[PDB]
Each structure stands twice: as C-alpha cells, then as structure tokens.
Design a protein around this ligand. Structure first.
Ligand code: NA
Length: 262
C-alpha cells in the first residue's frame, strides 16, 4: 500500500528512473505490486522464455535437446562468451539454452530464436500459455535499445511473474522440461549482485538478469526458502542514472524490501 509505495518511490528518486516490482508468496497468496502493470524493457530476461519455448517444442515431440546446431561468425554478436568458443564444432540446443540462461549468451539466444520462429514465434508461444502482454519484436542486440515510450520488446512485472510461475511451478511445460528450466535458472552465474544479494542467506534462487541501454537493469526469479512454498519475484528498472555497481544495489535493495514486506 501507500507506505510501501513511498519506499519504492524513495528508491526511484535515489537512483533516478523507474522501478517495477511484482512479488507473490505462493504460501500465503500475498503480493507486492509497484508499477506492476507498466511496461518495461525485457532485455536479457526473455532468454529464459526462449529456452522455455525450445523445451515446449521438445515436449511436443517436435524437437530434441541433443540436436547439434551449426553456426558461423556471421552469427556472433557481442557478449557471447560461450558460443564464441564453438564456431567450429557447433553446440547442442541443450548447451545453447544453458549458455543463454546461465551466461546470458547473446549469440545462443539468437540461435534459440532461430529454432522457435523468431521474436514473433516466441511471442506466439507466450500467448499460447496465457501471456497476452509480453512481446518480443527484435533480435540481439537491437532488442536492448530500451527506448522510453517504446512498446517493442517489453513485458510488465505482473505478466512476467505469472508467466515464470506457469513455466517453473505450473503446468506450461512437462515435468522434465520444467525441472530442466529450473536447474538452468538455479545455475545462473550472472545474478550474484542482484536478487541473490538482497535475500536472506538460506534462500535458493533460480534467476535471469537483464541489462540494457537507458540504464536498464532487471532480474526475475523463483525463490525457494527453507521449509516454505516458493516466492515469485519480478523486478524491472529503467532510466536510472547510476554506475554498474549501484544499479546492482538498486535491484538487491528492492529484493530486500520485498522479503521484509511479503
Ligand atoms: Na541483458
């Protein structure tokens, strides 16, 4: 409510820009919503959805995770630490999903989009599982432009939360794929300074980060506290004016506030 809105508003003033939060404690049904229905640029948070879409093709017997994908240097875009090592041998869809999630590998993400029907295909998938809000329009790296007032390549914290819940806890995917997406997000290496840094120590998190222009910094996660039902958390921020270290701190702090209020 208003008291809590004041706190998130103080963060927005502190860092500049615009902050969105949706959190849901599945064990009590309590939620936190701040700009939860406003659009924010997804940046790399879509890569979890891209992997999901590949898994959904496998569930439907139309695809195999072992299938080897060949690619060239014409496919390499910036920030592709994993794929930039396997041009010669190629990589499997499993390896590409893992790389896109755990290392936010841009080239791997574009490759997943290839096998999925592109941004329009990924969006189509999202509609198929009840997400009528989230939209991907472009490929890496252009999708990170994060232009103010631009609806392309956006979600809302509430839509992304609902979607992540369906994918990781609901029945949008088979048990095997759901478990596989779960393992990948838990194995993320890019999220240490963000949601993970704001939560109490013993809480297990699977997450996917995002970084983009106009000072965009995001993180979406499922959280498994000991002896409790899981929490779904989507945090988006854009437009802030702060260094890399403190954009990280903005997200961690919002996460910390959430754990106190939820
Ligand atoms: Na990113």
């Amino acid at each position: 409510a208003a008291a809590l809105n004041d706190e998130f508003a103080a963060l927005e003033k502190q860092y500049g820009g615009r902050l969105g939060v949706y959190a849901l404690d599945t064990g009590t049904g309590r939620t936190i919503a701040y700009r939860a229905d406003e659009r924010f640029p997804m940046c790399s948070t879509f890569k979890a959805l891209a992997a999901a879409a590949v898994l959904a093709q496998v569930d439907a017997g139309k695809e195999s995770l072992d299938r080897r994908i060949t690619y060239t240097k014409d496919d390499l875009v910036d920030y592709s630490p994993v794929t930039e090592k396997h041009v010669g041998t190629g990589m499997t869809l499993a390896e590409l999903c893992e790389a896109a999630i755990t290392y936010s590998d841009n080239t791997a993400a574009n490759l997943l989009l290839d096998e999925i029907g592109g941004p329009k295909g990924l969006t189509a998938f999202l509609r198929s599982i009840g997400d009528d809000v989230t939209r991907l329009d472009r490929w890496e790296p252009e999708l990170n432009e994060a232009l103010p007032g631009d609806p392309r390549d956006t979600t809302t914290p509430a839509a992304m939360a609902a979607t992540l819940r369906a994918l990781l806890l609901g029945d949008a995917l088979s048990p095997a794929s759901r478990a596989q997406l779960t393992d990948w997000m838990r194995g993320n290496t890019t999220g240490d300074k963000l949601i993970r840094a704001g939560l109490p120590a013993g809480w297990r998190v699977g997450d996917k980060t995002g970084t983009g222009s106009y000072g965009t910094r995001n993180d979406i996660a499922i959280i498994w506290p000991p002896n409790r039902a899981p929490i779904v958390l989507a945090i988006y921020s854009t437009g802030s004016t702060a260094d890399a270290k403190e954009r990280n701190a903005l997200i961690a702090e919002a996460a910390k506030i959430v754990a106190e209020a939820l």
